[PDB]
Amino acid sequence: DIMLIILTGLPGVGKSTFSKNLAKILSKNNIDVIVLGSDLIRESFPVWKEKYEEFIKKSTYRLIDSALKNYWVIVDDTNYYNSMRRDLINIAKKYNKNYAIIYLKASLDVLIRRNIERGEKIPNEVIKKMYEKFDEPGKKYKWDEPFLIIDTTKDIDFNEIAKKLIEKSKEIPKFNISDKIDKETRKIVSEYIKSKKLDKDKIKEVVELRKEFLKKIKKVDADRVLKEFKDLLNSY
Amino acid sequence: DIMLIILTGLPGVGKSTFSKNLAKILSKNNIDVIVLGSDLIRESFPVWKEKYEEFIKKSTYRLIDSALKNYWVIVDDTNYYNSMRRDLINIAKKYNKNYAIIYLKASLDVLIRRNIERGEKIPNEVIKKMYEKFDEPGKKYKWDEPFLIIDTTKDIDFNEIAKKLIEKSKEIPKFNISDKIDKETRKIVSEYIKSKKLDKDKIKEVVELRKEFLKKIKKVDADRVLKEFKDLLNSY
Numbered sequence: 363d364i365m366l367i368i369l370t371g372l373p374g375v376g377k378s379t380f381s382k383n384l385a386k387i388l389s390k391n392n393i394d395v396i397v398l399g400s401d402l403i404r405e406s407f408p409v410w411k412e413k414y415e416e417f418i419k420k421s422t423y424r425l426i427d428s429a430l431k432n433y434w435v436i437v438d439d440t441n442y443y444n445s446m447r448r449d450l451i452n453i454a455k456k457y458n459k460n461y462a463i464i465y466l467k468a469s470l471d472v473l474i475r476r477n478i479e480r481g482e483k484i485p486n487e488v489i490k491k492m493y494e495k496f497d498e499p500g501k502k503y504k505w506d507e508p509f510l511i512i513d514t515t516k517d518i519d520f521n522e523i524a525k526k527l528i529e530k531s532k533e534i535p536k537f538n539i540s541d542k543i544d545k546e547t548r549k550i551v552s553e554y555i556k557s558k559k560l561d562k563d564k565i566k567e568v569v570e571l572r573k574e575f576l577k578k579i580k581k582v583d584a585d586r587v588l589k590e591f592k593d594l595l596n597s598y
Numbered sequence: 599d600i601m602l603i604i605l606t607g608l609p610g611v612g613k614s615t616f617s618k619n620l621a622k623i624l625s626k627n628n629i630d631v632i633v634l635g636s637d638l639i640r641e642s643f644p645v646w647k648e649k650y651e652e653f654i655k656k657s658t659y660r661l662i663d664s665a666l667k668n669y670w671v672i673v674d675d676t677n678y679y680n681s682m683r684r685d686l687i688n689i690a691k692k693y694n695k696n697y698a699i700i701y702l703k704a705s706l707d708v709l710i711r712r713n714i715e716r717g718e719k720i721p722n723e724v725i726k727k728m729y730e731k732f733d734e735p736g737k738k739y740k741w742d743e744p745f746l747i748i749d750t751t752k753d754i755d756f757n758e759i760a761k762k763l764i765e766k767s768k769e770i771p772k773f774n775i776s777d778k779i780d781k782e783t784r785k786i787v788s789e790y791i792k793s794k795k796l797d798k799d800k801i802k803e804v805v806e807l808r809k810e811f812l813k814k815i816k817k818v819d820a821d822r823v824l825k826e827f828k829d830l831l832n833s834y
């Protein structure tokens with residue numbers, strides 16, 4: 363009756379816009395749905411610090427868990443790693459609810475241009491690295507395969523998507539430190555870039571710096587690693 | 599060393615703006631602070647339903663409780679009832695944290711113009727009535743007295759405020775169905791006025807209808823009363 367909807371897709375792809383549109387159609391069909399995402403909590407702090415991400419994450423999972431007892435939930439978050447998608451499916455699993463992964467995609471050119479339009483809050487170079495490195499959902503686990511893959515440069519038919527999701531809802535549900543280090547070093551890089559307003563060339567060197575640093579680290583303690591990373595950017 | 603700051607004041611008075619300014623100055627002083635308010639969760643649903651309010655309230659308090667373990671928290675909410683201020687103080691008392699109530703005020707005319715400015719999302723006559731019936735913090739209980747009273751029609755010295763709060767945070771800490779029905783009947787009224795686009799004369803009828811209704815109810819369980827109120831507005 364209640365379902366968990368898990369969005370996944372890169373920054374600028376249109377997750378927030380899609381969530382809002384999908385929620386409006388669902389509510390028009392008398393479904394009680396809430397849209398929840400990490401940016402809810404993250405943007406409630408006046409500044410970003412790496413040490414906030416743990417509270418942001420858990421607070422987000424908590425609200426989803428609480429919500430999914432009474433309401434459909436649409437999870438509006440990049441969900442860049444399969445371990446994130448697994449953590450969310452485990453919430454549905456806990457309350458025996460169905461779930462549907464909706465993967466939104468657009469070409470890199472489109473994502474960059476949308477980024478430029480939004481005032482390049484994330485550096486273009488970082489979205490480009492994200493796009494190159496993204497493992498498309500379902501590439502490894504059957505439980506990770508999307509219910510819908512949606513091309514956000516093409517027409518999207520919300521009624522159809524609502525219809526399919528509400529059908530799915532009546533079906534029977536059947537069913538990492540490296541990800542942390544990868545994710546937080548990328549966020550630190552982005553903060554540094556925006557904070558120090560780095561020129562294009564410097565942006566490139568810092569993205570490369572991170573790459574080389576992750577090559578070394580792979581060949582660990584998450585905090586020690588991220589602390590060394592900040593120290594590295596400062597030195598550099 | 600951590601503190602709960604509880605805002606209180608009518609719609610349009612400048613809570614959310616004040617919160618962002620104060621969080622900025624606190625963070626500039628290396629304080630870890632988060633701004634939380636029931637609208638985070640209320641605005642995450644695509645429409646408003648009365649049945650959501652309990653979830654909203656509880657989810658809000660749970661985020662505050664969780665946050666106050668590690669961060670200063672600024673509570674950005676109307677906090678119209680002293681019962682709401684009591685619940686928030688009790689979270690501070692639970693963790694033995696200092697708290698400060700900050701009462702924000704502005705004249706009715708300024709509230710209306712700001713309301714108009716922003717599109718009259720809450721009917722002006724409802725603002726007027728809230729202004730009329732508002733009980734200023736500390737009217738009855740000593741634990742309810744404002745640490746600070748702020749006139750948002752004048753400039754605000756956030757440096758002084760932060761200094762006063764940091765000083766306060768180093769001190770040793772020392773420590774309802776009628777409200778629900780009052781609150782939700784107002785929200786229902788506001789939502790009918792907007793959804794129905796009532797003319798100004800019908801608005802005043804409906805406002806009076808709520809007043810008359812609340813009289814009769816004082817002479818109960820909240821769900822049934824609220825369903826009847828809606829039935830009354832539909833009839834009327």
Ligand SMILES: Nc1ncnc2c1ncn2[C@@H]1O[C@H](COP(=O)(O)OP(=O)(O)O)[C@@H](O)[C@H]1O
Nearest residue numbers: 372373374375376377378379380476480514515
């Ligand atoms: N389907 C779409 N078609 C065209 N533009 C879109 C679409 N969805 C979102 N946008 C635009 O792309 C930008 C990023 O949208 P947003 O929903 O904020 O993406 P995300 O939440 O994935 O970061 C916004 O400017 C939005 O207006």
Ligand SMILES: Nc1ncnc2c1ncn2[C@@H]1O[C@H](COP(=O)(O)OP(=O)(O)O)[C@@H](O)[C@H]1O
Nearest residue numbers: 608609610611612613614615616712716750751
């Ligand atoms: N101190 C102030 N002086 C002038 N305008 C203000 C002040 N504080 C807020 N405003 C303006 O008043 C309107 C409502 O402010 P907001 O902070 O959203 O109030 P609240 O959160 O109390 O409803 C906004 O359009 C805002 O820009």
Ligand SMILES: [Mg+2]
Nearest residue numbers: 377378379438
């Ligand atoms: Mg988004």
Ligand SMILES: [Mg+2]
Nearest residue numbers: 613614615674
């Ligand atoms: Mg506000």
